[PDB]
Structure formats: C-alpha cells, structure tokens
Amino acid sequence: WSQKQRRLLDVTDGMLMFCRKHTRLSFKKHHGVIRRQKTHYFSNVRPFLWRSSRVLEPPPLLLYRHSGKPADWQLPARPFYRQGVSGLLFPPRLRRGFPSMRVNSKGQFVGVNKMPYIAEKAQP
Amino acid sequence: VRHMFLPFYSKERGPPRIRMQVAGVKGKRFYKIVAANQRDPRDGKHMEVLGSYAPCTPSGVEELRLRFSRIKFWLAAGAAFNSKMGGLLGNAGLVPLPPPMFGWRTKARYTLLESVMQKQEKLRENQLREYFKTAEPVVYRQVSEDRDDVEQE
Amino acid sequence: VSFKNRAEWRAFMRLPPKSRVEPRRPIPRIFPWRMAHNPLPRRYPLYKHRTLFLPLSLPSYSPQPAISGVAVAPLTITTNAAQLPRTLLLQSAVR
Amino acid sequence: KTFKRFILRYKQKEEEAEDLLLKRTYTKPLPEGWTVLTFLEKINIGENAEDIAAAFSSWTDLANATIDVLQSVEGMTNQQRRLIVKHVRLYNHGLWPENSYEDYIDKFQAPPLENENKEWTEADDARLLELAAQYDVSFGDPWLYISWE
Amino acid sequence: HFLLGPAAIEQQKAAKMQRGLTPYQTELFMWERQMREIRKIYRAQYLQR
Amino acid sequence: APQKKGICVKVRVQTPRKPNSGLRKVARVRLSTGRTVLVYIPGIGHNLNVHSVVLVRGGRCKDVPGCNYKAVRGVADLLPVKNRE
Amino acid sequence: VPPPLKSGIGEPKKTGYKFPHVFFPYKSRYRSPHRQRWWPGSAPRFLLHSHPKRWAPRRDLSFAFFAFHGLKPFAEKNLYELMHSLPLRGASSYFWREADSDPWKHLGRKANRLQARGVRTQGRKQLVFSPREIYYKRRPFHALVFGRLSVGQLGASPPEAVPPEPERAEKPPDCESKEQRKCAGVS
Amino acid sequence: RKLRLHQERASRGHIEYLRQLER
RNA sequence: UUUUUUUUUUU
RNA sequence: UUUUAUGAUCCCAGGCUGGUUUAAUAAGUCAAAGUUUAGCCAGAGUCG
RNA sequence: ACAGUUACCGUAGCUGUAGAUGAAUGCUAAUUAUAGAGUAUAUCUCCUAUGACACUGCAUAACAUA
RNA sequence: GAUUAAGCUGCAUUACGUUUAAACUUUACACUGGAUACGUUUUAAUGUUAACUUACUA
RNA sequence: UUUU
RNA sequence: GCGAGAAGGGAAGUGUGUUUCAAAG
RNA sequence: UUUUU
C-alpha cells in the first residue's frame, strides 16, 4: 500500500534544523530495574493482559503486486515456548475439548452457564 | 435441536447477545468482545470470550482478533448483536455486509466524488514516470540558487 | 516553510485534534520474554556478543529410520538456536 | 530517527489538503433563493440567529464545517449544535427535498428487472428445473437465490 | 458464495418499497431475511461435523 | 496509630541510671486515649510547661527507665524551632 | 405546588389518603402510573380528572353557571358537549377530528422534540363519523354514541369541509373514535 | 481451488498448524 | 538503538 | 423415648470466593497449611 | 542472609541488615503541554432541597398522492 | 367544609471529635431503556484536578 | 519534545 | 404502552459460600 | 529561554 500512494516531497535546507542534535552518542539514561514488583503488576500488566496464553505478533500477510490479492502459499505460524523447552511427558486432561458443552443422562450434548476461568490456559 | 441452547438462555437476565466491553488503563482503553445476556452489566459476568478490538494502535491501523470457529457457532444459537457489531463482522466476511446509514440508493453524490478521487490518483502516476528517467537528488531554482532535496515515500 | 522557533515546530508535527471522550493514546507492546522487567548489563562488560540460546532436548527416544537414505538420528545433545540441516529434513517431511 | 517521522507526517498533511479541495468544489449548493440566513431561519433556530450566520462566510464553509470548528463560536448551545449537523447531512444526500411519505416512493424507487412481466417459454421451463436440483428445496428459503438468477 | 459475494450488495438495492416506510427500511428488512438463511447453514454444518 | 496527640500536666527532671551521670529533662504527657506516659524532649532548650499540647511518637530511651516515647518539634503546638543547629 | 385532588361530578365522597404512594418517605424517584397531568403540555385522564366538582357562593349561582360545558373553547370541547346543542342531538350528521391545535403541539416542556423528518418547511383524506344511536349517561359530557365510521376527502375551500365522500364502507356502526376534540359538519 | 471467500482462507491456516503438531 | 515496513530476539 | 468429649444445653463479635508476570539446578506443569484491586452467588414485608 | 554480646565450651534470649508499602509527619523542588490500578474510602449534632415538572413513543387514527 | 392530614435506609451545608477522611468538566467512545429505522435520549460511563510513596522517557 |  | 432498589451491609454458625451432578412449563 | 562557531 505504501508503494501505491507515492508522492514527491520537496525538503529545503531550513526544514532539517530540528533534526540535528548536540550530543554525539546515545544510550538508555534510565535503568529498567523495577522498584515495586506487585504495585507495577496490578497497574500496568494486568489491565493490558486479556489472554491466558503468551502469543507474539503474527507475521504480515503477503499479497500480489499486479492483481493485489492474497496468495495461497505464505509463511507458517510462529508458536512460542517457555524457556525453549517444548516437551510434555504427562499432559493433563484439559476441559477445552467441548467449550460450554457437556453430556446429559440421556447421552445428548447440552450446554452450561458458568463464568470461564481467567487462568484456564495458564494452568496446564 | 433447540434443546441444546436451553441452558444458555436466562430468565432473570435475558437472551444471549454479543457486545463489547471497556477495560484497561485510563487513557489507553481497549475494547473486548465477549458474549453475555441483555441485562448483564457492561463489565461483569461473561459466558465466552470471542476476541478483542484495538481501534488505536501504534502502527495506526486498527487491529481485530476474533475466533472463526466460535462466532459462527454462537450465531446458530440465535444470538443478536448491535448495529456497530454487524459492520465490523461484515468486513471480515463472517456475515453479509450490512447497509450503511441512509441506505445505498441515496448514495448518489458519493459515487461521482469517488470517481474524481480515483481519476486523480491515476493521473498522478503518470507524473512520476518521467522523473525516474532524470532523477536528480539536488535541484536548484532560478531564485537564489537555493538547494531543494527530493525524496519519495 | 522554515522552522526557526520552537513554536513553529510544535504547530507542524502534532497530531490533529480529536474528541475528549474517545481514546487518543495507543496500546503498548509487551513481549513474551519481558512482561514487567527489562534485563540489561550493569557491569564492565557492557558491550559484548550475547548470542541467544534455545535448548532443544531429544524429540523422541525411539529409534527413527533414515528418511530417503539420509540419517536423521540425534548425534549430540547440545543444540543451538539455529536449526541444523539434518533436523530441517525431518520437520519438512512432517508437514 | 527524527527523519522517519518527519517525512511520514509531511506526506499525510498533503493528502488531507488535496482531499479537502475536491470536497469543497463538489459541494452541493443551496436552492434558488436560499441564503445563509434563510437556511438557519427555516430550521426554527433560537434567538441567536444573526450571530451564527455572521461567523460563516458562504454555504461552502457551513456544509464542510467539522465538529471541532463549530465549538469555537460562543453563540451555539448543545441543542443547536446537534440540530445543525442533522440538516446539512440530509440535504447533501437529498433526503429532505420535501418532507412527505409520498415523495420517497416516487423518487428513490425504480428497480428495473430484466425478466419482468414476461411469459414462460420452452427454454425457461428447463432452466427452472435445473436450478431446482442445484439448490435444496426442502431446506430454508430456496426462492431467495433462484429468484435472483 | 451468494450471501458473502458481491451479488448480495446489489440484491438489497433492487427491492420494492412500501408506503409509509423510509428508504433505509426497505434494505434493512431485505438484509434481515438474508441473515436468517446463514444461521441455518451454519447450524446444519455444525451438526453434520 | 503512627502518632497520637497529648497534653502535658507534669514537668520534672529524671536522673539517669548508673553509670550514666548528668540530668535528663522529661515530662509526663497525657495521651488523648486517657493514658499517661513519660516522654523525652530531645534537643537543647526547653519550652514545654503545664497544660501544653505536644505530639509524641515512637522511640525508646535507655538512660530514662520506663520512657518509651519521644516528642516531635515543629508539628507540635507552642513548640518553637531549635536554638542552634 | 400541585393542585389539590378533587372528585368529579357524579361520584360519592371518598377518603383522602395520607401519602401519595407507599414509598413516600423512603423512595423519591418512583412514580405512580395514575399520576395527575396538570403541568402545561399534557391532557387530562378523561374520566378521572377533567370535570372536578364545581362550587361557588350563593350570590354567583345562576342558570348560566350550569351552561359552562356548552360554552367551552374549541380547543377543549369534546364530542359529547358538541352534540348536545345541535339539532336532533347531532343525529344524522358528520364529524371529524382536527389535530392541528393540540396543547402539546404548541406548548409544553417537550415541545421541541426531533421528529423523523426534522422540521416542517411548508386536499386530505380525514375520517368521518356518523352518529346513529345516542345514549346519554352523565350529561353533557358523557354518552354512549354508536355510529358508522368511514373515510372522506376534504375540499379545496378555505375552511375544512367534506365534498362528495364518504365513499367506502369501512366498518359497521361502532363506538366513537376519539374524545378529545371534534368539529362541525355539513349535515 | 482459488479460495476467494475469507472463511475458506481462514480455515486453511488452521489445518496447516495442526498437521505440523500431529505425529 | 532498523531510510523508503506497520514486519525484525535490534544489543 | 432422644442428644451427649468425634463437644449434647448455652452468652458476645466476625458473610464466602478469583484475580494471568513473579528471578533461585526452593530452575514448579496450578506460586505449595493460611496474604489482594474493577468480579460471581446472595441479601423479608408493610398505604387498612 | 551475615555479624555483635568477659579475651574457654552446649542451651536460652536480644540489636543492625531483606522483601511486601494496602497510614501519618518533617526538609527541600510547581522544573516541556503525551501522569496510573483498588471498597472511590470511617462515627455524631443543627438547618435547607426532594415528592409530581424523571427517559422514550402521537406508529397514543400522523404532516393524509393531479 | 366537597380528598386539602408532606421532608428518608438517600444527597448537600455548617459544627464537634480524631495522627488522617475528597467538588472542577464543550460532562456526547460504549452498555442500556424506548422504538417501524445506527429515527431519539439519559450525571451510575468516560475524560481532567493530584502531598508522584507506580511504568515509560540523549 | 532532541515528534504537542 | 414499556423500563426503573442499577444510591441497599439491617438478618444468619453449621449458616452464608465452594465442589460433584442433574433439569424437553 | 537561545542556537551551524
């Protein structure tokens, strides 16, 4: 999309006055050392977290040049693993197989009315 | 197979519905799409979480994460939604695109205006073609021999 | 347009005015490897090569055969983040 | 680093400037005999009638007026602000030429159908039978898609 | 492919109006009928799978 | 409570226990909860008298036996600033 | 302050309640369904508060006092009151409702509501009533009038008149339509 | 072939991810 | 602490 | 005939639960007897 | 998680030092205009307002076809 | 005389006690009531004031 | 604001 | 015609809650 | 606040 809406911008010498800076080098001037582990967690971590699993940003979608339509073959998913290890020897029996669905006395499938656990996926 | 949705329906609260929520930190609020009853509070009990919505993102493009295997399943149960919800789902292709405000037949002046904008974009393309043949980083002018840089984006 | 004073610069790069009730600021990004902490060196060795390591143990203890004559058995347990060519063949055929 | 954002901001500013120019040129003018004050007089505006009209110059500046700009004027209450924005949106779309239920069915109603008021021929009978097998009959409303074809 | 295809958009416009109803109402009711067909399709597919 | 206000009704000079010699100025301050307890007045000078309101705080004094409170300068009432410091 | 409660004519004396509603002391936002309508821009409850008991000194009593109903303004004269003075009790006549001078349409708190169209920037077909059977219970403001309801087209004359319709037979002789305001007829 | 609908393309990715994890 | 990217284990 | 130290009779006060990250070969696969912050369930009646 | 308590050795009991910051107070700073999460915080006395004007609908037979 | 019989389990001002105990908005993104209509509208929402007992910031 |  | 305690801590100890199941007015 | 010595 950026390549389609192309424009010619004229930049004069006076427009780059604020771009220049005095200091030559640059680096972090404030250590990332956290002071309060609990106070910060319940102020800037919990509100910004709405999922029970750690998921990274997915890759971008590839489109054609001429036709401008998505292609079939593209990059695969990007699963994430904690500490690199991706092996479980005794996996538990999760309840996510039938979301909001259970078995009745008759054998039929019926729903439920309950609040989902916020840490359902975070407790394997 | 209406027997399978009995539990879902609530006599005290009401029938199921799809809406959004408001949660986060002050100044950086983000929408959260969930499923709940009609009389339920905006921030409270929820049956299942369908996804989220971020109308303001650092990249400048609105993001939308949804479940394709849950939204379709819930609609079969007879779950309604607000007018705004239908528009967002229509673009994703899950449901037919709803008509905009005032309908489609009244959209007469916009059609002509859109054509003018499209024509201008095509004409602008023709202008830049010639530039590449004689691209000059530095171009002066007959005023004060002032330097003027050129850069695309 | 020439930028001379700070007032002129302020009135040229600022975003357009918006409503007071709608959200204006964006949502920050939180990486999986850093939720509420930013590790960094705080010692003499402040600039050195710090390669990322991804431990990968054996996938299966059973004896696997050779795929198309190319052996895909594990030789050593030490594996770096970069995928070895021998392992890339097994995963390619799995899909 | 500063150059990345400076270039992007400059490009966006040009897009808005060019887009606004076309909108003003293709703005729908008022009918014959309708001035700036006449538009605000037929809407049952409050006492502050001449003050609002004085701020604006012509009709183009009023139709294309945004919401933030309208708040600058002191002589505009909440009731008046929400009323003016409704009128400009209706006249632009031609939804308020003459308020009456009879005008809507005569102006915005004329769908021409190709196969309308025509007899059934030998070829038509075969076509209907073929579509019957393609779309399930005893499932939902089979007449919704076959009718369009 | 019909409801989710381009044919659905043009189908709403080609509708007969009724006395006492606004132009937007004619398209709204037509769209509502289409929304009823998609629900049955999903319900049948879910049960079969 | 972190702090509790009180009123002084007795001013005396208690001699510290041996081998610590000298004299230490103390005053019996009546807490707002209807309880009396001795309080030390650190710092040079003295301005507290009978029927004076003073704010006390925590702190133990080894030289003065029993005293387990200290006064606060400035925030208290009718307690001027130090002389030389 | 609100007007005191009064009983209409033809009703026995009742005992006044101590409080307007059950939740008088505790709650304040609750409102009773039978609340009085006296604020400007409303209408009475017909037979609950329209005709309260009328009293005056002995000196003011006269024949003309009893004829107050028949001299009411056009904006408050109902059908019952109108038919009482007409020849033959207004029998074999035509009547129609003119919804152009309602109290709420000119005055009231909510007199500037936003309609679906917006604002009014500028021959009709009004219903016609033909009273057949007339039965007066509580004169001059009460009656059980049965008549034939039909549709008719207005004329081009300055006033509101009915040229050659009624034409279609809508329904058999039924109860009256409205009890708020009515006009005269050609007869 | 040539899945034009958004729903068809969305389901394609789900199958690909599940196939890799299946052994 | 990434020119044309809104992607990047940047270090 | 019935309860009763595995607390029968009996006096005062306290309503139950969840909340994602969280360093260390206490490397938790659910934070390991008991610690919380938008939240679930639940909370009599009266105009005589 | 480490030291100190006669200048010999088991118990026992103390001072400083860690984290969690869900009170108050003292000194010094209003220093670009991208500053936040929770019961939105307790007891008692006098006086004033509320209570008939609270949201919506005339589709509550309306504005009614050359 | 005609029914003439009015001031909270709520909110606000002032005052006392205690180490401490909360008033400034074009209040219009949402949810929700009403409804034939994204046709109306409402302080329980949202955004600002702050002794920072917190994040980010050549 | 060395992006308001 | 429809909605409205959306400002409730006054009652209770084996109770209020939690957990396991069930529910074709 | 000011700004290519």
PDB file of N, CA, C and O (backbone and C1' of nucleotides) in Angstrom, chain E residues 24-25 28-29, chain L residues 36-39:
ATOM      1  N   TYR E  24     -34.293   3.464   3.877  1.00  0.00           N
ATOM      2  CA  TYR E  24     -33.384   2.586   4.604  1.00  0.00           C
ATOM      3  C   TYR E  24     -34.099   1.348   5.130  1.00  0.00           C
ATOM      4  O   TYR E  24     -33.489   0.278   5.231  1.00  0.00           O
ATOM      5  N   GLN E  25     -35.384   1.472   5.471  1.00  0.00           N
ATOM      6  CA  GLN E  25     -36.126   0.326   5.987  1.00  0.00           C
ATOM      7  C   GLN E  25     -36.236  -0.786   4.952  1.00  0.00           C
ATOM      8  O   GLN E  25     -36.161  -1.968   5.306  1.00  0.00           O
ATOM      9  N   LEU E  28     -33.021  -2.652   5.039  1.00  0.00           N
ATOM     10  CA  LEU E  28     -32.795  -3.300   6.327  1.00  0.00           C
ATOM     11  C   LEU E  28     -33.574  -4.606   6.429  1.00  0.00           C
ATOM     12  O   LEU E  28     -33.030  -5.633   6.853  1.00  0.00           O
ATOM     13  N   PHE E  29     -34.852  -4.587   6.044  1.00  0.00           N
ATOM     14  CA  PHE E  29     -35.655  -5.804   6.106  1.00  0.00           C
ATOM     15  C   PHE E  29     -35.129  -6.858   5.141  1.00  0.00           C
ATOM     16  O   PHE E  29     -35.103  -8.051   5.467  1.00  0.00           O
TER      17      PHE E  29
ATOM     18  P     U L  36     -42.711   0.135  17.141  1.00  0.00           P
ATOM     19  O5'   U L  36     -41.578  -0.145  16.058  1.00  0.00           O
ATOM     20  C5'   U L  36     -41.628  -1.290  15.218  1.00  0.00           C
ATOM     21  C4'   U L  36     -40.959  -1.026  13.892  1.00  0.00           C
ATOM     22  C3'   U L  36     -39.621  -0.305  13.963  1.00  0.00           C
ATOM     23  O3'   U L  36     -38.550  -1.209  14.176  1.00  0.00           O
ATOM     24  C1'   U L  36     -41.007   0.699  12.307  1.00  0.00           C
ATOM     25  P     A L  37     -37.242  -0.754  14.985  1.00  0.00           P
ATOM     26  O5'   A L  37     -36.465   0.184  13.959  1.00  0.00           O
ATOM     27  C5'   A L  37     -35.946  -0.330  12.742  1.00  0.00           C
ATOM     28  C4'   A L  37     -35.129   0.705  12.012  1.00  0.00           C
ATOM     29  C3'   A L  37     -34.179   1.523  12.874  1.00  0.00           C
ATOM     30  O3'   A L  37     -32.966   0.841  13.138  1.00  0.00           O
ATOM     31  C1'   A L  37     -35.370   2.956  11.403  1.00  0.00           C
ATOM     32  P     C L  38     -32.289   0.914  14.594  1.00  0.00           P
ATOM     33  O5'   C L  38     -30.798   1.378  14.289  1.00  0.00           O
ATOM     34  C5'   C L  38     -30.546   2.483  13.434  1.00  0.00           C
ATOM     35  C4'   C L  38     -29.439   3.354  13.969  1.00  0.00           C
ATOM     36  C3'   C L  38     -29.062   4.550  13.109  1.00  0.00           C
ATOM     37  O3'   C L  38     -29.930   5.656  13.289  1.00  0.00           O
ATOM     38  C1'   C L  38     -27.103   3.405  13.764  1.00  0.00           C
ATOM     39  P     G L  39     -30.531   6.430  12.015  1.00  0.00           P
ATOM     40  O5'   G L  39     -31.746   7.272  12.612  1.00  0.00           O
ATOM     41  C5'   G L  39     -32.523   8.120  11.779  1.00  0.00           C
ATOM     42  C4'   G L  39     -33.782   8.576  12.475  1.00  0.00           C
ATOM     43  C3'   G L  39     -33.590   9.238  13.832  1.00  0.00           C
ATOM     44  O3'   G L  39     -33.234  10.606  13.733  1.00  0.00           O
ATOM     45  C1'   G L  39     -35.310   7.622  13.978  1.00  0.00           C
TER      46        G L  39
END
